[PDB]
């Protein structure tokens, strides 16, 4: 026969899926597939929490396909070899999938498509994870943006796309078809343990399309009205917690935008309206960094701006280790690193703090931090993670004047009652917020909690010194 294969990667859902929907309009004999790529799975940069969330999403996706009328095929190996072989064995009319913004995915995709074309099989690659593709947002000169402000002005004025239809009444493969591909398929979805991973720390939102959709609806029904200023406080559960759902596409970007938009239209309060606009802004920042990675792939290599490619990083391994173990001696920093390693997620204000600390205070090539985050974030995303770390030094997009966060000021400002500190550092619940914020804790009262590993004031001067010396040297 002539079926269409839809290749899932970061769009683990059946609803509001551009590529899937396009494929369904061409054929009801729509068969989904997912390929466990060893280059990604065996990577030292893969986070156990991310594999757990992923596996959970795949489990639901298998059911969704089964309920729709067909199935989700599972494979383990090199994509440019296995996918074309599968398509050929199935005499596929075509293979569809949604475009990636990352160097690895785009290179791989080019190879799969070329392999498919050689086999005379049509490959269709459409945009799905962004409200607007990188090619849609350009300046009057037709160039990409490296400054947020102007990018937002353009992005904001663009007509927003709406959710597409969930495919239904699919036609499943026949025994003869199944026999032709048997050798390329895994008999069942491997469990996290079978893959060699273990995770028991939970998630910001349970895995799966259904849970993602439920969270979006719950958030936009209430919490979103207070997004601003609730978003600023790690102690408050003021954010959506949809990050992993967006990274793996458990939820569609158009559904997210539409839900927020409907909440804005339903609200009759100025403050709520503003809170919702602010949340929508977050989605814009998301596209700013994804577009940037797409337009400037070298960003993924490390410090982007020339000056920073030459920064004299001290790189004291011991300080890094202490940072990764939440033993810096800075309560606000340690409480954040603990939440990360224990739950695979961290409040954005905290990511900003620990990143600033690692780069400015510990003076360690921020790539070590970017890597550590990727090794632990359930929402670990190259575009966003790299954007965040380039941000800790203004070494990439949207650069700002040299600045160094003062852990104490941030803690006092965003966790005034030290509620968040105490939460993730229970062995310090007896200490007074006052001291947990200043980071000056008396030895006895400090019990086993380590003392500050660096003197902020001395580190601050050291960093500025190196910066200026290099700035001048240039």
* Residue of 285, 314, 342, 406 with catalytic role: 285
Among 154, 232, 274, 313, the one annotated catalytic: 313
Which entry of 7, 155, 366, 424 is annotated as an active-site residue? 366
Q: Count the residues of the shown chain that bind ligand FAD, applying the rule CB under 6 A.
A: 28
Instruction: Give the residue at shortest CB distance from ligand FAD.
Output: 388
Name the active-site residue from 323, 389, 391, 424.
Answer: 389
> Hey, how many other C-beta atoms are within 10 angstroms of the C-beta on 312?
11
Active site residue 385: no
What residues between 193 and 232 interact with ligand FAD by CB under 6 A?
Answer: 231
Element holding 72 (H helix, E strand): strand 72-76
Question: Is 127 annotated as catalytic?
Answer: no
DSSP single-letter state for residue 404: -
Selected binder of ligand FAD within 83, 319, 355, 437 (CB under 6 A): 355
DSSP result, 257-270? HHHHHHHHHH---H
> Would residue 430 be called left, alpha or beta, if left means φ above 0 and alpha means ψ between -120 and 50 degrees?
alpha
Side-chain half-sphere CA neighbours of 409 within 13 A = 7
Region of 344 on the Ramachandran plot (φ > 0 left; ψ -120 to 50 alpha; else beta): left
- Alpha-carbon span 284 to 292, nearest angstrom: 12
C-beta of 88 vs 274, nearer to ligand FAD: 274
Active-site residue flag, 313? yes
Stretch that binds ligand FAD, among 68-76, 134-142, 234-242, 405-413 (CB under 6 A): 234-242
Cβ proximity to ligand FAD, 6 vs 323, nearer residue: 323
The alpha carbon dihedral of 394, 243, 45, 328 has a sign of positive
Q: Which residues of 382-408 are buried (b: 16+ CB within 10 A; e: fewer)?
A: bbbbbbbbbbbbbbbbbbeeeebbebb
Among positions 283, 300, 307, 408, the unique one binding ligand FAD when judged by CB under 6 A: 283
Shortest Å, Cβ 44 to ligand FAD = 16
With binding defined as CB under 6 A, does residue 242 bind ligand FAD? yes
Interface with ligand FAD by CB under 6 A: which range of 40-48, 259-267, 280-288, 455-463? 280-288
Residue in 204, 207, 228 with CA at minimum distance from that of residue 282? 228
Applying CB under 6 A, among 13, 215, 247, 412 the residue interacting with ligand FAD is: 247
Closest to ligand FAD by CB, 351 vs 456, is 351
Distances (CA, A) of 112 to 39, 87, 117, 165: 15, 11, 9, 27
212 CB contacts (<8 Å, ≥6 apart)? 13, 205, 242, 245, 250, 251
- As given in the structure block, the two tokens for residue 143 are 């160039």
Least separation in angstroms between CB 232 and ligand FAD: 10
Catalytic residue, candidates 232, 274, 348, 406:
348
Looking at 182-268, list the stretches that DSSP marks H as alpha helix, in order from N- to C-terminal side. 209-221, 227-230, 243-247, 253-266
Interface with ligand FAD includes 285 (CB under 6 A)? yes
Sole window of 41-49, 101-109, 262-270, 285-293 interacting with ligand FAD (rule: CB under 6 A): 285-293
- For ligand FAD, which is the closer residue by CB, 249 or 331? 249
Strands (DSSP E) contained in 157-234 are none
- Binding residues for ligand FAD restricted to 316-345, rule: CB under 6 A: none
Can you spell out the DSSP letters for 303-319?
--SHHHHT------HHH
Orientation angle between helical segments 367-374 and 317-324, nearest 10 degrees: 30
Asked if residue 351 binds ligand FAD (CB under 6 A), the reply is yes
Shortest distance (Å) from residue 396 CB to ligand FAD: 12
Q: Which of 63, 154, 177, 348 binds ligand FAD (CB under 6 A)?
A: 348
User: Is residue 352 a contact point for ligand FAD (CB under 6 A)?
Assistant: yes
Rounded to an integer, what distance in angstroms lies between the CA atom of residue 74 and that of residue 83?
A: 11
Stretch that binds ligand FAD, among 19-27, 45-53, 70-78, 236-244 (CB under 6 A): 236-244
Q: What angle do CA 225, 231, 232 make, to 5 degrees?
A: 140
Q: Are strands 94-98 and 72-76 parallel, antiparallel or unpaired?
A: unpaired
Which of 239, 255, 324, 359 lies at the binding interface for ligand FAD (CB under 6 A)?
239
> Least distance to ligand FAD from the beta carbon of 118, Å?
36
Does the annotation count 348 as an active-site position?
yes
Looking at beta carbons only, is 71 or 423 nearer to ligand FAD?
Answer: 423
Contact (CB, 8 A) for 288 and 380: no
Binding to ligand FAD by CB under 6 A, coded x per residue (else -) over 364-393, reads ---------x---x-xxx--xx-xxx-x--
Per CB under 6 A, residues contacting ligand FAD are: 231, 239-243, 246-247, 282-283, 285-286, 289, 348, 351-352, 355, 373, 377, 379-381, 384-385, 387-389, 391
Q: Which residues are catalytic?
A: 282, 285, 313, 348, 366, 389
């Amino acid at each position: 026969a002539a079926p269409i294969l839809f290749w899932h990667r970061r769009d683990l859902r059946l609803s509001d899926n551009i590529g899937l929907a396009a494929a369904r309009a061409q054929s009801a004999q729509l068969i989904g597939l997912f390929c466990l790529d060893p280059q990604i799975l065996q990577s030292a940069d893969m986070a156990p929490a991310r594999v757990a969330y992923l596996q959970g999403c795949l489990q639901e996706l298998q059911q969704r396909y089964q309920q729709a009328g067909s199935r989700l095929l599972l494979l383990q190996g090199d994509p440019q070899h296995l996918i074309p072989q599968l398509a050929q064995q199935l005499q596929a009319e075509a293979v569809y999938w949604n475009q990636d913004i990352e160097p690895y995915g785009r290179d791989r995709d080019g190879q799969v498509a070329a392999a498919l074309k050689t086999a005379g099989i049509r490959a269709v690659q459409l945009w799905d994870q962004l409200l607007h593709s990188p090619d849609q947002i350009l300046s009057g000169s037709g160039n990409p943006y490296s400054v947020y402000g102007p990018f937002w002005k353009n992005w904001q004025a663009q007509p927003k796309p709406t959710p597409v239809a969930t495919p239904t009444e699919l036609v499943d493969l026949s025994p003869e078809q199944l026999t032709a591909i048997a050798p390329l398929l895994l008999s069942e979805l491997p469990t996290l343990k079978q893959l060699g991973f273990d995770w028991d720390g939970g998630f910001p939102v349970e895995p799966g399309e259904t849970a993602a959709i439920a969270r979006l609806q719950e958030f936009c029904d209430r919490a979103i009205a207070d997004y601003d200023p609730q978003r600023n406080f790690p102690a408050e559960a003021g954010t959506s917690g949809l990050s992993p759902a967006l990274k793996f596409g458990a939820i569609g970007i158009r559904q997210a935008w539409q839900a927020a938009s409907a909440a804005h239209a339903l609200s009759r309060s100025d403050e709520a309206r503003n809170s919702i606009r602010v949340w929508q802004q977050e989605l814009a920042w998301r596209e700013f960094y994804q577009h940037a990675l797409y337009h400037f792939p070298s960003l993924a290599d490390g410090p982007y701006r020339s000056l920073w490619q030459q920064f004299p990083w001290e790189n004291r391994e011991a300080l890094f280790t202490a940072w990764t173990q939440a033993q810096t001696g800075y309560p606000i920093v340690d409480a954040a690193m603990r939440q990360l390693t224990e739950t695979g997620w961290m409040h954005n204000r905290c990511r900003m703090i620990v990143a600033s600390f690692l780069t400015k205070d510990l003076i360690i090539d921020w790539r070590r931090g970017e890597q550590f985050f990727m090794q632990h974030l359930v929402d670990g995303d190259l575009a966003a993670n790299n954007g965040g770390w380039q941000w800790s030094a203004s070494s990439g997009m949207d650069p700002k004047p040299l600045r160094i966060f003062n852990p104490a000021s941030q803690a006092k400002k965003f966790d005034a009652t030290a509620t968040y500190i105490k939460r993730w550092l229970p062995e310090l619940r007896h200490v007074h917020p006052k001291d947990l914020i200043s980071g000056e804790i008396t030895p006895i009262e400090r019990r086993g909690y380590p003392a500050p590993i660096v003197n902020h004031n001395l580190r601050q001067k050291q960093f500025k010194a190196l910066y200026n010396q290099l700035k001048a040297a240039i």
